[PDB]
């Protein structure tokens, strides 16, 4: 079964940073890309980047640069999100997606979401 | 009669064309895409069908037939009978064993090159840009977009020569 | 495929053909390990356990053999006049009355499997002077020990058996296979008391041939508490030929005649049950699905069966070659 | 093959393969419809319909069949002595004589078949106190009513028919086929009347083999008057055996040797008649020309043939794949 | 092993060739034209009679066989020799089917390519003038009249690769 | 399926095969040689080596048959059993000559061409400095020495083009 | 049967127009060339043009430049010559006939020609 | 079975020409290259030159240039040595030898060898 296992939900610091994983499963991971998407509650689903499990390609949104990053571990089967300077705004519930080669992009799976709470209390 | 292309310079091969057997595979400024190839893959399965149909479907209708499971022995002519229903078992295994050497020797032969159409195509525009790749993947110095893989595809290509790099 | 850097001056491409990581290994002309894509096992491996007679009519076993119900099984009262494409015999089945011994048995199973079509005309016949619808012993039929009902057992009538002169032509369009048989006794006695004086003397002859056969008196092993055999002979004949019982001893005789024609009928020997498919290969282990073009699940087949390999995993490459890493 | 147009200081020479406009439909092992420009029809669809008998030695079976034309068939009396490579009966088989019942008919067929050379050589004999010669009533020749020319019917002379035991050494260096055969009469007062007192035994033996044989007598079907059977057997023999005809009754003796040679002949059952050709290939339906590697004309060959196949219209690509627009 | 240029960049041929089985045309200044080859024509022939060898005439003198054709039914030595002759013809019909199929599908695939001697015969002095062809319609920059053609054909060609005023 | 080199553009070929089937030879200013790839050769000899595993030994052990050679004929039975047997011989010499012949056909069609890998490999040196030559020997412009036609041999090699000429 | 079929004879004006026409049949038109030969009564045959029916590629002898102009039609299998400025030296029978591709040009099929007078009688 | 066989024994004046022969057979003369290997008397192995049978490619030793010239003969499967401008120091026995192509040059079948002497006496 392809399902793209997904952590819990996480509480940090506005400012602070988080790293996300996302365990891939039942397929050959350097054959299909990784993309992720945001979906803050009550708002739009947004695409913010994709990796090449292969060689490691990044294309990122151009609205989140310096602040989304895409890192995987061949190894483990394993992407992984890195996010840098939160802000309130920030808090969405992200979806691990799979993904078609390149630029047709039909996300084929997807994930489970976790979610992303940015708070001082 | 090996090609060496599957084997040979496509070493590895991405295993995402799930739509097609064949595809064309790119880089670039706006995103590395796939592609697939309806025609190559088409005319592929097209005869992997065409071969299954004297195979897969319309056997021989061969209703009655001499016994072949046996007993306690008889004669001489129940001899001949095993005899030439292990020799017509033996022939057909031979027979069938070499069958599926050729079909899947043949099957291997031809879906193999045929990649000379994107060659010769490809050619007449990048002759002049830095002259003539060949190695696997075509590095074509044409920049353009998605819209020329499109017409690469659609076998619907001119030949926008790129004067500005001669030799270098 | 390792494609070049991303910034490539912007002025590049690439191009590629196939993978997917499963794997399969088929045989070649070269190496007997290359691995493809995809492959269709051209020999069916495996059956469905179950004789599924949809496509062909195929008749039951249940303890009775085709040559039982041919001779009229006193088991088996329910397959007379039975049209059948394929007959099953059971391998629990067993012989029932007197142990009837065919010299040319599998000829006559064949021959009878060919034909592949029961009609048994009840002809009238010219039986003069003889006991018909003798009773036996080892017949169970309603407890009531009722001989073969496809045909006739001869003995002396009135303390005399007349040498028989029975004749029936071929009026018909069709050939008419007759079942005839001769009586092989226990004893001397057993044919001087039971059948005619002394030895016998039996000629069955058509226009374009002739069979005959002297009875043979012996003391065969008991089955079933019957210590003698009876021999089953068949006497084909062609339109206008006229057959001619003639017979001065034993004489196992027919009730009339049964159908021939030229169809595509066949016997199998088989233990399966009758199920419900569309299937119209029939294998003794079952009938298998014919969408491949070998098979290595039995020698025996009937209808439109792949053919039978020594084989066991012969796979085409219906895909092509893979290269999965 | 488009070309430009009318350039001078380029040369664009497309060049180019063959076409041909019509195209024929060949089968590929992927394709089952490609077209060729040229084929060659390997099956041999059709023939000229006429047997022709130039190349080989046809011999003509004009109310003939073999068996009675080693016999003496009085319709075939004009075929004695008769090399041949291949003989043809007729369909129309009309063989009227006494009803001959070889039980291993198609065994002398095949084997004199083989053999295919007629030396009937009148061999000398030691039958003593035998009425040799005798008198058919079905065979027609001269209007005398004679039996075959080549068996002799020995009956009783003067009412005594002595146990006969002759003999004829294999002193030469080539095979001796004897060709007997023993009477089945209707009746066993027909035995006693013609033959010999009550039954009749015959025991032929060579010195490495024996065959003996019991006749048989009853009431056969009627054909052209006659109620009785002959059946006739071979006893072929070695250089240096001994042949040793041992009868006491119904004794039908060959009246010598047939030479038998393992060379180039058949029989084939046809009804096309004789011609003349140049073609070494022969078919029930007539003489096919031998320049095709597979037929369809019939299953039984003789001579430089070429293979019969189930298929109808294989053609050879005997050119390139033709694109003829 | 289909090679894919009579199906492939030889799109259909033309049917003004009485003279051979493969082609050389040409677009000369002194008129166009066309003309058969010699030695590919005829291996092809050559090639194609020796397929008929074994196949036109060497047919098996088998005299005396047995009987394939029945009138009454006999039992277990009749439906043997039937099932004999069954399975003998169709062993034969499937080997005259297979064979057929084979040598078809070789003929269409040695009948294919063998453009690449042209090709490179051609290739050392199409290397300077404005670059080379890759189809079966080569467009030789060397200016040159039909004795060149003459040449080309003729597998005698010197290599007067054309300096200036080219590619561009 | 022929590819045309070993009766094609090798029009000679050297007599050294005592290393290898195939071979590497050179000229240089420091004294020609002769090589042997020892990847295409032994690819061609596992090629045959698996021909022969079907062929070489692991032969079908039947031990007890029918009786094939005779004595004085008995009419019917040994008939069919010399027909049957004829048959049989006929099938499988057949079967064997048709084997001879599409393996000796395969073997030469596979021990054929595969200098698309060294043309491939050189192409990108000789795209720029001089060109490309494919009549009979493989002319390479890269001035250099027997450590580079050794990387030509290791198929380890780095494309370094010499740019100060284009192509006279 | 390989024939190509020609018209009847015509008597027009010195200086008019006239049309002939060659209907082709049994071959296919496009490969094989269609030529056309002039020959005046007693004189020498007389080569006119050259055509090839796939995309009519026309060559001119250096004589009849302005005089012969050669079209085909390719649904109907057929040539045609047009004639202009006709003077009674053009007076001839002109031969439709078939051809081998380009320069080889040898005519293996004819035609049976066309009475062509010209005068003012 | 393969054997280089020359010639005999020879005796020259000083300054003297003489020419050796190298008869090679069992093989096709044109496929191994012919190598000659001179032997001092009492000292070591030298390499004289290298010839192709094929075209006659000839290359020399650094010290060999104009003294040793190298010929051969394909119809008779031979070669020869000429010698110019002998001395005393050239007294040694010469063998032919075989070889592999080109700058690899195992000898893989050797010569028995001739005695030269230069001398007056
Ligand atoms: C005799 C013959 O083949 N005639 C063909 C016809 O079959 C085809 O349908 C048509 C299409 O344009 O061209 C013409
Ligand atoms: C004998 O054959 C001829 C033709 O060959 C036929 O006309 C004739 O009727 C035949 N004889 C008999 C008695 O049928
Ligand atoms: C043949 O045999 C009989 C008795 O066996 C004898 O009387 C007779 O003389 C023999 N024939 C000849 C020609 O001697
Ligand atoms: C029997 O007939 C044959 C010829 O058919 C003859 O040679 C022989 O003498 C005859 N014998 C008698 C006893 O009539
Ligand atoms: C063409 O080749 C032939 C021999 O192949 C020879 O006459 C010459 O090289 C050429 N002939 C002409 C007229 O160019």
């Known amino acids: 079964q392809v399902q793209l296992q997904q952590s819990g939900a996480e509480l940090v610091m506005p400012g602070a940073s988080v790293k996300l994983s996302c365990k891939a499963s039942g397929y050959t991971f350097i054959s299909y890309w990784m993309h992720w998407v945001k979906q803050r509650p009550g708002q739009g689903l947004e695409w913010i980047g994709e990796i090449d499990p292969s060689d490691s390609y990044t294309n990122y949104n151009q609205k989140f640069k310096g602040k989304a990053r895409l890192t995987v571990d061949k190894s483990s089967s394993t992407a992984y999100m890195q996010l840098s300077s939160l802000t309130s705004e920030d808090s969405a519930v992200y979806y691990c997606?799979?993904?078609?080669?390149?630029?047709?992009?039909?996300?084929?799976?997807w994930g489970t979401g976790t979610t992303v709470t940015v708070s001082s209390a | 009669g090996i090609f060496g292309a599957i084997a040979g310079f496509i070493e590895n091969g991405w295993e995402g064309m799930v739509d097609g057997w064949y595809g064309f595979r790119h880089q670039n400024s706006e995103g590395r895409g796939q592609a697939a190839d309806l025609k190559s893959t088409q005319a592929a399965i097209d005869q992997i069908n065409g071969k299954l149909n004297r195979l897969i479907g319309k056997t021989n209708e061969k209703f009655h037939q001499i016994e072949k499971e046996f007993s306690e022995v008889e004669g001489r002519v129940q001899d001949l009978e095993k005899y030439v229903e292990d020799t017509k078992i033996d022939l057909w295994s031979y027979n069938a064993e070499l069958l599926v050497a050729l079909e899947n020797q043949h099957t291997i032969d031809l879906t193999d090159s045929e990649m000379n159409k994107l060659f010769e195509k490809t050619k007449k525009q990048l002759r002049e840009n830095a002259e003539d790749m060949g190695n696997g993947c075509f590095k074509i110095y044409h920049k353009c977009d998605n819209a020329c893989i499109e017409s690469i595809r659609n076998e619907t290509y001119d030949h926008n020569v790129y004067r500005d790099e001669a030799l270098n | 495929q390792k494609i070049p850097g991303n910034d490539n001056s912007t002025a590049t491409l690439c191009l590629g053909h196939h993978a997917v990581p499963n794997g399969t290994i088929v045989k070649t002309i070269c190496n007997d390990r290359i691995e493809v894509t995809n492959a269709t096992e051209l020999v069916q491996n495996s059956s469905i356990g179950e004789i599924c007679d949809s496509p062909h009519q195929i008749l039951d076993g249940e303890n009775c053999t085709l040559i039982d119900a041919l001779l009229g099984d006193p088991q088996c009262d329910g397959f007379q006049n039975k049209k059948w494409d394929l007959f099953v015999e059971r391998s629990k089945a067993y012989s029932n009355c007197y142990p009837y011994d065919v010299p040319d048995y599998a000829s006559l199973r064949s021959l009878v499997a060919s034909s592949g079509t029961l009609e048994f005309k009840n002809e009238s016949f010219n039986w003069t002077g003889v006991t018909q619808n003798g009773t036996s012993s080892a017949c169970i039929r309603g407890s009531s020990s009722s001989f073969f009902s496809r045909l006739n057992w001869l003995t002396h009538l009135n303390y005399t058996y007349p040498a028989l002169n029975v004749t029936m032509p071929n009026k018909e369009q069709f050939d008419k296979l007759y079942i005839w048989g001769v009586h092989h006794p226990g004893t001397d006695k057993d044919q001087i008391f039971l059948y005619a004086q002394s030895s016998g003397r039996i000629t069955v002859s058509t226009k374009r041939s002739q069979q005959a056969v002297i009875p043979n008196i012996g003391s065969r092993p008991r089955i079933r508490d019957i210590p003698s055999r009876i021999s089953i002979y068949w006497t084909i004949v062609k339109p206008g030929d006229i057959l001619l019982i003639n017979s001065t001893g034993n004489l196992i005789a027919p009730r009339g005649y049964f159908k021939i024609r030229s169809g595509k009928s066949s016997i199998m020997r088989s233990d399966a049950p009758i199920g419900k498919c569309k299937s119209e290969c029939i294998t003794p282990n079952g009938s298998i699905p014919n969408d491949k073009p070998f098979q290595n699940v039995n020698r025996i087949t009937y209808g439109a069966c792949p053919r039978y390999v020594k084989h066991s995993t012969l796979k085409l490459a219906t895909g092509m070659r893979n290269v999965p890493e | 093959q488009k070309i430009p147009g009318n350039d001078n200081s380029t040369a664009t020479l497309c060049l180019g393969h063959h076409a041909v406009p019509n195209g024929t439909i060949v089968k590929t092992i992927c394709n089952d419809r490609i077209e060729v420009t040229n084929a060659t029809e390997l099956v041999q669809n059709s023939s000229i319909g006429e047997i022709c008998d130039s190349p080989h030695q046809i011999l003509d079976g004009e109310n003939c069949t073999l068996i009675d034309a080693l016999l003496g068939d009085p319709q075939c009396d004009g075929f004695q002595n008769k090399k041949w490579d291949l003989f043809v009966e007729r369909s129309k088989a009309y063989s009227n004589c006494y009803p001959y019942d070889v039980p291993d008919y198609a065994s002398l067929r095949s084997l004199v078949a083989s053999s295919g050379t007629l030396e009937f050589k009148n061999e000398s004999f030691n039958w003593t106190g035998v009425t040799q010669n005798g008198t058919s009533s079905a065979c027609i020749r001269g209007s005398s009513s004679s039996f075959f020319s080549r068996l002799n019917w020995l009956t009783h002379l003067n009412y005594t028919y002595p146990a006969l035991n002759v003999t004829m050494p294999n002193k030469e260096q080539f095979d001796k086929l004897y060709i007997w055969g023993v009477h089945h009469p209707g009746t066993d007062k027909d035995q006693i009347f013609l033959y010999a007192q009550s039954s009749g035994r015959i025991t032929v033996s060579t010195k490495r083999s024996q065959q003996a044989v019991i006749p048989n007598i009853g009431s056969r079907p009627r054909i052209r008057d006659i109620p009785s059977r002959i059946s006739i057997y071979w006893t072929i023999v070695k250089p240096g055996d001994i042949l040793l005809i041992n009868s006491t009754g119904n004794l039908i003796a060959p009246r010598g040797y047939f030479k038998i040679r393992s060379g180039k002949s058949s029989i084939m059952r046809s009804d096309a008649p004789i011609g003349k050709c140049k073609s070494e290939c022969i078919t029930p339906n007539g003489s096919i020309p031998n320049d095709k590697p597979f037929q369809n004309v019939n299953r039984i060959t003789y001579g430089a043939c070429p293979r019969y196949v189930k298929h109808s219209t294989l053609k050879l690509a005997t050119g390139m794949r033709n694109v003829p627009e | 092993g289909i090679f894919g240029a009579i199906a492939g960049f030889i799109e259909n041929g033309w049917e003004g060739m009485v003279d051979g089985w493969y082609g050389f045309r040409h677009q000369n200044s002194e008129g166009r034209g066309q003309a058969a080859d010699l030695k590919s024509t005829q291996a092809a022939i050559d090639q194609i009679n020796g397929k008929l060898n074994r196949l036109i005439g060497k047919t098996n003198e088998k005299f005396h066989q047995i009987e394939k054709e029945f009138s009454e039914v006999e039992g277990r030595v009749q439906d043997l020799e039937k099932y004999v002759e069954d399975t003998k013809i169709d062993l034969w019909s499937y080997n005259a089917e297979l064979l057929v199929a084979l040598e078809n599908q070789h003929t269409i695939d040695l009948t294919d390519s063998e453009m690449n001697k042209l090709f490179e015969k051609t290739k050392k002095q199409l290397r300077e003038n404005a670059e080379d062809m890759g189809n079966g319609c080569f467009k030789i920059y060397h200016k040159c009249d039909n004795a060149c053609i003459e040449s080309i054909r003729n597998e005698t060609y010197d290599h007067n690769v054309y300096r200036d005023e080219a590619l561009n | 399926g022929i590819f045309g080199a070993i009766a094609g553009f090798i029009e000679n070929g050297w007599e050294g095969m005592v290393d290898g089937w195939y071979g590497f030879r050179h000229q240089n200013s420091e004294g020609r040689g002769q090589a042997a790839d020892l990847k295409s050769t032994q690819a061609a000899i596992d090629q045959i080596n698996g021909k022969l595993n079907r062929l070489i030994g692991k032969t079908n052990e039947k031990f007890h048959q029918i009786e094939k050679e005779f004595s004085e004929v008995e009419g019917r039975v040994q008939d069919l059993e010399k027909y049957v047997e004829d048959t049989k011989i006929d099938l499988w010499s057949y079967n064997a000559e048709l084997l001879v012949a599409l393996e000796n056909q395969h073997t030469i069609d596979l021990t054929d061409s595969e200098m698309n890998k060294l043309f491939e490999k050189t192409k990108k040196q000789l795209r720029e400095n001089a060109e490309d030559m494919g009549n009979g020997c493989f002319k390479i412009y890269h001035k250099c020495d027997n450590a580079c036609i050794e990387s030509i041999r290791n198929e380890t090699y780095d494309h370094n083009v010499y740019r100060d000429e284009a192509l006279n | 049967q390989v024939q190509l079929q020609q018209s009847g004879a015509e008597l027009v004006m010195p200086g008019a127009s006239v049309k002939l026409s060659c209907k082709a049949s049994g071959y296919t038109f496009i490969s094989y060339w269609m030529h056309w030969v002039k020959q005046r009564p007693g004189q020498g045959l007389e080569w006119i043009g050259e055509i090839d029916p796939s995309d009519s590629y026309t060559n001119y002898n250096q004589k009849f430049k302005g005089k012969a102009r050669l079209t085909v039609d390719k649904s109907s299998s057929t040539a045609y010559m047009q004639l202009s400025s006709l003077t009674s030296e053009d007076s001839a029978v002109?031969?439709?006939?078939?051809?081998?591709?380009?320069?080889?040009?040898?005519?293996?099929?004819?035609?049976?020609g066309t009475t062509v007078t010209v005068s003012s009688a | 079975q393969v054997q280089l066989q020359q010639s005999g024994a020879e005796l020259v004046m000083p300054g003297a020409s003489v020419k050796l022969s190298c008869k090679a057979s069992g093989y096709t003369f044109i496929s191994y290259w012919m190598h000659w290997v001179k032997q001092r008397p009492g000292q070591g192995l030298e390499w004289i030159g290298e010839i192709d049978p094929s075209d006659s490619y000839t290359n020399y030793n650094q010290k060999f240039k104009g003294k040793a010239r190298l010929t051969v003969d394909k119809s008779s499967s031979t070669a020869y040595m000429q010698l110019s401008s002998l001395t005393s120091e050239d007294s040694a026995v010469?063998?032919?030898?075989?070889?592999?192509?080109?700058?690899?040059?195992?000898?893989?079948?050797?010569?028995?060898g001739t005695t030269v002497t230069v001398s007056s006496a």
């Open positions: 997606a799979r993904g078609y080669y390149g630029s047709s992009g039909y996300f084929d799976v």
